[PDB]
C-alpha cells in the first residue's frame, strides 16, 4: 500500500482544461483508448484505456487495460475520473478532481497502489506529471 | 442478418464492378445462386460498421492494408485454399493477406500508382519532380498545366512524401514498430514541402480531387496525372494518347508508392462461406474471371500466374511493376487505419495552408496513434469522438455512437 496525493494548478480556464482532459494520444502519453458507455440530470462517461507499461514486463507480457469512470454532472464546475487495473494480481486506483481555485483551474489527485511497489508508485506519479503536461499540450494543438 | 443461399459482394467504386457482375452472372448461370455486386460509398468505413453487427456483404474487396484491422476485429473468415490452389498465385501476394499466420483473404491483383502522361502535349515526360515547375510554367503559357492528381487521398501524395525517407511504421526483423511513426522526418517534410511549394507557386490547386484530375487529363487540359491501373479504362474512352511510366524522382530518389494487393475477404458472419470460396477460387481467380474484370477496369498485375504472364506484355503493367518495385508493400497491421487519416489530414491542412508543413506533419505523427481497442473500429471512433467534442460546445451524435460501440464491443468479447 503506497498512496500519492498531489494537486497541480492549471493556468487555464476550467472549460478548456476539461476539454483537454477528455483527449488522450498526447506525445507524452502512448496509451490508446475509447468511450464505451456515456449517458447524461448530469453527464457520466465510461472509457477503456489500454496502457502499455524486463522481468516485470514478462510478468505482464500481455497489454494492461485501464477502466476510467468519470462524471461531469453539477452546474458547479466539476469532473471526477476513476481508474482501475485489469489483471490478476494487485490494484491501482487514480482519482482526479478538476475544479478551479483562486478562472484558472486546479486538480487534486490520488494514486492508491496495492500488491517493487516503490517502482509502481514512482511510475504512476510520473504518469500524472506527464498527464498535466499532455493536457497543457492538448490545448495548444486542439 | 446476411442472406443464406445468395452472394453479395462489395468492391470499391473505382474498380471493375460491372465486370465482376459478369463473373457473378456466370456463377449464377452454373449454380442458380444469385450474385449481387455493389459499390457502397466509403466502403472501407462501412464494412467494419455493418460487419461488427454480423451484417454486410458475403465478400469484400479492398486493398490488403485494411484487412489486418478487419481480421483483428473478427470481421473476416480464415480462408483455406488447398496447396494446389495456392501454387496458382504468386507467393508474395499470399503473404500480403496473411495475418498472424492465417490467410484472411484471396489476393487478386497488385496495384501501384504510375505517372500518366499525354504524348501529344508531352512526348518526353519529366524524370524528376524538380522539372515540373518549369514544365508547368511553359504549359500555362499555352493555357494548359503540367500535372494534376488527387490531393484529397494521401495514397496519391505518399509516393512523394516517402521518396526521401518518409515512412509509416518501422520494420525490423519481421515486426512493425508501432511506437515509431516516420511521418514527421526530414524526408517526409521535404516531400510535402515540395508539394506545398507547387501549390504556393500556382502549379497546383489545393482542392484538386480524383474527378477533377481525371476530367482535366482526359479532356486534354493537363499533360500528366498520377493514378492506378483502374483509371486507364476512362482514358481509353477519351481520345487522349497516353503513356504510363515511372513516377518522377525526388531529390534523386525514386518516388515510393504504397503498394496494395486488391484482396477479397469472406465476411466471418456469412452463412455462405463455401459458396464464397467456390466463387472466388473457381470463377474469379481464373483467366476468364480476371479478364472480365480487367476488361472493365484494369486490375494491375494480377496474382494469378497464368493470367499475369499474359498481362505482363502490356507496357502499362511493366510500368506499374517498375513503380511497385521502387515502392513498398503496405503494412496490414491494424494501425494503418489511424496512419492513413493522420496523413490525410496533414496533407489537406498543409496544402490548404491551415497548417505549416512542420506543424501538420508533427500533428500527424501523433495522430497516427493507433487510436482504438477495436482494430477495425478506429474510423467509427474518429467520426464519433470528433462529434462529442463539438458537442462540448453545447455542454445529436447518438447515430454515430451506436455504431462505434458495437464495433469495439465485439473486440471486447475476446478480452475482459
Ligand atoms: O488514401 C488512403 C487509402 O490508400 C489506399 O487506398 C487506395 C486503394 O488501395 C485503391 O483501392 C484505390 O481505390 O485508391 C485508394 C485511395 O483512395 C488504401 O487501400 C486505403 O486503405 C487508404 O485509406
Numbering used by the authors:
A (entry chain B): 1 to 40, 47 to 59, 66 to 114, 120 to 132, 141 to 167
B (entry chain A): 1 to 395, 405 to 425
What does the primary publication say about this deposited structure?
The Mdm35 homologue in mammals is TRIAP1 (TP53-regulated inhibitor of apoptosis 1; alias p53CSV, p53-inducible cell-survival factor). Although it was originally identified outside mitochondria after activation by p53 during mild genotoxic stress 16, later experiments established an evolutionary conserved function in complex with PRELID1 for PA transfer across the intermembrane space of mitochondria 8. TRIAP1 thus contributes to the maintenance of cardiolipin (CL) levels in the inner mitochondrial membrane of human cells, thereby sequestering cytochrome c and stalling apoptosis. Crystal structures of free TRIAP1 and the TRIAP1-SLMO1 complex reveal how PRELI-like domains could be stabilised during mitochondrial import and the location of a buried phospholipid-binding site.
Crystals were obtained for the apo TRIAP1-SLMO1 complex with several diffracting to 3.6 Å, and the structure was solved by molecular replacement again using the MBP structure. Four copies of the TRIAP1-SLMO1 complex are present in the asymmetric unit, and Table1 summarises the statistics for the processing and refinement data. The structure reveals an intimate interaction between the hydrophobic stripe on the TRIAP1 chaperone and the PRELI-like domain (Fig2). The TRIAP1-binding region on SLMO1 is delineated by the region between residues P13 and L39, which encompasses the edge β2 strand, an ordered proline-rich loop and the α1-helix (Fig2B). The cluster of three phenylalanine residues at the tip of the TRIAP1 coiled coil structure (F19, F23 and F28) interacts with a hydrophobic cluster delineated by M22, V38 and L49 on SLMO1. A second hydrophobic patch comprises V33, L34 and V36 from SLMO1 together with F41, Y44, V48 and I52 from the other end of the hydrophobic strip on TRIAP1 (Fig2C, left). The first turn of the N-terminal helix (α1) is unwound in the structure of the complex and forms an extended region that interacts with the edge β2 strand of SLMO1. V4 in TRIAP1 becomes sandwiched in a conserved hydrophobic cluster delineated by L34 (β2), L54 (β3) and Y77 (β4) from SLMO1. The folded PRELI-like domains of SLMO1, Ups1 and PRELID1 comprise a large concaved 7-stranded β-sheet decorated by three helices on one side (Fig2), which encapsulates a hydrophilic cavity within the core (Fig3B). Although this region is partially disordered in our crystal structure of TRIAP1-SLMO1 in the absence of phospholipid, the defined regions superpose better with the PITP-bound structure, which may indicate smaller conformation changes in the PRELI-like domain upon lipid binding.
